[model samples]
Target: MSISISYSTTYSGWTVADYLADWSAYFGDVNHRPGQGVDGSNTGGFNPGPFDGSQYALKSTASDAAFIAGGDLHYTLFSNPSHTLWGKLDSIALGDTLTGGASSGGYALDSQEVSFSNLGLDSPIAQGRDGTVHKVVYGLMSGDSSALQGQIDALLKAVDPSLSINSTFDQLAAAGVAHATPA
Candidate 1:
């Protein structure tokens, strides 16, 4: 089975902020506010690097509660949330949609723990061959995404059965399906 996908056609770059800007544009806070969504301006400081390189990373000590307007929350409240946070946000992470991911970017790719290819995208996380590569980014969002992630991964595996949750771009490249190109 497949799902609806979206593309941020306005921006045309591959910076960390670029990704966030697109994510915010379409997936911004459910209310359409930029606060809960991630954007180039909101992300505190970041290492920002080649989309496929190890230098790309982020960190911040902001609190989730410092931004959002509530205590307990749902995944639908913001464009993205933490995979572990879910509706159970602590005082710091709720700021997920706030900017840098409250308390820290907590970006799952610390030192290269994960990358876009692992989510079924290109070496630099560009639009896929079918043009829906961007959707994998959403499916991987920390906001109620375990389910989304599962669906995307399953589809990608249909093209390259060896992809793992943390496979790198080079790995996907070797398999000939980083972008989930039509086979």
Candidate 2:
């Protein structure tokens, strides 16, 4: 199971280096459990292990020239609805945009696409495709952070299992909060 989010921004001063830096920081914050995953190792690059550094491996890519940044989580992490996964991905996208400072009037997430593969282990999260994995895109209303946040919360509730739903996502969650209160 891999996750990737690609988005474009028109914010000034944004650069490929900036996106890469953000990705590095985000991954660094998470627990880095090397040699984890299905085959005892990450297949296509350094897998930081999604969130808990348990079942998934993390990877990222960025393109300042095109105002884009993408991330990948290898192996299955979440169950059904995948709302939690979406929240995490959306938060990352929004966080990257916000971290680049303020947008020069053109700040907005044009599009976001998430894909999943190698599913079928968890009963909560559904499986995708039958024979092989494929990329799937979910459309969002331009500049609709509220809707994004709602989904984020809903996802948290789904797997909360308790009142304290916080995890390694604290930083990303903070970024989302800041985005909402940007002044």
Candidate 3:
């Protein structure tokens, strides 16, 4: 079953809502925060946006290397916003998850989504300019980002060549559960 994950600002500086707004400002994307309901009050179940998934803020030197990668799976926009492993994940508490599941051991990835409209604007304008709306992060997710899907496809192919390829997430989750082998 798909899990329902919850995030709080008390822990990380941003919630799903705050992160999404930051994303829009950061990427200058017109569609950064689209769809029903501003903020997470109503996501129609798809739950668009970002979450404070890691401590790395994506604004340091470590991020520079990943930018040079070929189809860098680590560099794309994450549905759950996170910090860079070397830059921000350690200091920010994004990697310090306090909860664990019975089977997955730790929380799953990219389970949370945030929107950009709910972020509050600054009260005062900078210098003579109007209040600027600017935000960015370690990364952002496009509507059709597919790096993760490609990895899943390759992994499944390696495990079961006879099984159908390109299984939807719903299909994988519904494939029926099995007990994991002893480590």
Candidate 4:
């Protein structure tokens, strides 16, 4: 009974570098936003300060490929394969899913997985007429229904702890569902 979500966005005439740089900049902006600072809590030490193209591109091989692809003026972003979140989660596409039982180790439970693909295509970026096309695809899953419910609950609490919501998700996770706490 775990909940799954998928989404995508397509773009046209934008190099991979443009998206990479923009995404990196967004992370940097989050890390330095007003009261937020890189105290190891943000980005899990993956993204620290100055999240500029040069700094982030150096840390991630994927980003570097995008950066290089930009200079080449060719559509090679998809050729340089890597992952944005978990490396294994990259290939999953919409309508693709997995279901399994609990794992042998009590600390871990099987996950309910789903994929989102080709978010964007023919989407315009800047005021360019290069006519390049690009898309974003990604996947996500929960360790267990309980874990998924826990996440939903956490999100709700973030908005308003006192807010009331349906217990269906919570009940699914609480019944015969168990898993290790996320890091």
Best by TM-score: 1
For model 4, name the residue pairs that clash: 8-119, 9-119, 9-120, 10-119, 10-120, 10-121, 12-123
The better-scoring model by TM-score among 2 and 4 is: 2
Candidate 1 ranges beyond 4 A from true positions: 1-142, 179-183
Model 4 segments beyond 4 Å from truth? 1-7, 29-40, 43-183
- TM-score per candidate, in order? 0.25, 0.21, 0.24, 0.18
Model 2 TM-score relative to the real fold: 0.21
Sorted by lDDT (best first), the order is: 1, 2, 3, 4
Query: Measured by TM-score, how close is model 4 to the native structure?
Result: 0.18
- Candidate 3, superposed: residue stretches over 4 Å from native: 1-140, 168-183
Instruction: Kindly list the per-residue Cα lDDT of model 4 for residues 58-130, writing each as its tens digit.
Output: 1121221111000111122223332122111111221111112112111111221122121122323331322
- lDDT for each residue of candidate 2 in 1-183, tens digit (9 for 90 to 100): 221222232322232224333434442322223443333222212123333211222222222111111233223434443322221222233322221212232222333221111222221124432211112111121111233233334444443433111322323233332111211
| Cα RMSD (angstroms) for every candidate in the order listed | 16.5, 15.8, 17.7, 17.6
Question: Residue-wise lDDT of candidate 1 within 1-183, one digit each (tens)?
Answer: 221122122221233223333333333322212357566533322112112212122232222211221123222222232111122111111112223333352233211111232232221112221223223223323222343344445655666575643444344444554332221
Candidate 2, position 71, lDDT? 34
**lDDT per residue (tens digit) for residues 1-183 in model 3:** 211112332323332233333433442322324462333222111111132222112211111111011110121223223212111111111211122322332232221221111112221212111112111221222222132223323444444553222433233334531111111
User: How does model 1 fare in lDDT?
Assistant: 0.29
Clashing pairs in 2: 79-124, 79-125, 80-124, 80-125
Candidate 3 weakest ten by summed lDDT: 64-73
